[PDB]
Amino acid sequence: SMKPHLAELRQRLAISVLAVFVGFIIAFTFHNAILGWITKPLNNALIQVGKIVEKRENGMITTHQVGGAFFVALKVSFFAGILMAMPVILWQLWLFIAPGLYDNEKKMVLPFVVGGSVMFLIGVLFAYYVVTPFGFQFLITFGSFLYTPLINIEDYVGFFTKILIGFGIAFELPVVAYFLALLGLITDKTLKDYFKYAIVIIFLLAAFLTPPDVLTQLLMAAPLILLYGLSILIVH
Amino acid sequence: SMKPHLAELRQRLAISVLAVFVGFIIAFTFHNAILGWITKPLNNALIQVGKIVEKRENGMITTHQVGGAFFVALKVSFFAGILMAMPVILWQLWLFIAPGLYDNEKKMVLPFVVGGSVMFLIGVLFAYYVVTPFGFQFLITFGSFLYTPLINIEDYVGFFTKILIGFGIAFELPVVAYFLALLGLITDKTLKDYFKYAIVIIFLLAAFLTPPDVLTQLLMAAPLILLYGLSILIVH
């Protein structure tokens, strides 16, 4: 079947794996700094909540698994290496489809991917420096008068990367909408008509991006529906 | 196919969803009181165990997730709204099957559902006010001499809801057995002969209501087997 078009795929995957490996090595070397950067918002929120509680009248970052610290360090290093391998993962992926983009879409793809990457980066930066500091406090001040916030690093790391990745994508969808709309391929009528259909697929996507709880599915579908409405407004 | 019998289904689902939404709104308004009611037995058990330990010679309710308090409040509100929308849920469900119960079962269904609901509420009340206060202590005093009880609200809410719901059902099965037996449809012979087959389905049902561990599957199948024996005795 597709036997001749496999050697290039093998080489691309080999270079991708090597890139992920070197990124992992560098990230594990810098794991102290990376973990400090990840945990700074949580520490600041805990200190602020403690000050508020003391003014009204403890908190710390814990680990609930014996290998929890090592597992968290390894996971953060792996994620950073994958992120540090993004330029080379694109180097492998784009070079794979060489004849697909003959002369025109070959020129159109580069600004699109550049804009998507820069907007994902700006979304992650906005999530870390704006949304999280004013949100984590609100998440901790809610239970500050009923419970004690013993936050484990194992769950916190996953929660933090989930928020960062989602907010990065949340700033990418209304840029791919802009690219597609200004390209002229899709008009406002197409998205306005296919509104009910979106209703289900978004609700399906939330079913796959959340734990099995129905409440999580609703809490993920609502922002996605808001983003769909935002794209509806954006297309002109 | 079943196209004409779909508009009524759509209307029933829509009004049920609206009822669930209004219940969620009310429950999130009263979430402080609801969470206090849920967490009162745990606090009492912690205080009693602490007094016992001090007399022999700490404990608190914690949250292990940054959004754990908000998620717990939302989950409790959603559960309360679903419970608060149960009367209108049955309003929609019963009205759906209008012609199925022509003249006799139409009048026989109402006492059955009324009795089932009242026994479910009495079972929840019995579990909250009798079983839990004398059980939670035993679940905490068992490990009070080896470990420290830092109970997270995220798992406690699920555990308490599961116990309450199961005990409500545990007081409903030997009422549906009573209804079926007094109706005359099922005698003692039917349940006595079909004993071995039950051994399967219960173990299957207990397999679907538990985490993947085998031990908890057995620990759920045993009370169901006891309930089956109780129903066997009840048939008269």
């Binding site: 009910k196 209703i199 289900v200 609700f203 399906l204 079913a207 796959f208 099995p212 129905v214 599915q217 609703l218 | 779909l6 289904l9 759509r10 689902l13 829509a14 969803v17």
Partner: peptide
């Protein structure tokens, strides 16, 4: 998924 596809079915019935 898991028990959430029920809600997907529900949204199809609610939105045709």
């Amino acid at each position: 998924s898991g028990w959430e596809l029920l809600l997907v079915v529900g949204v199809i019935v609610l939105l045709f």
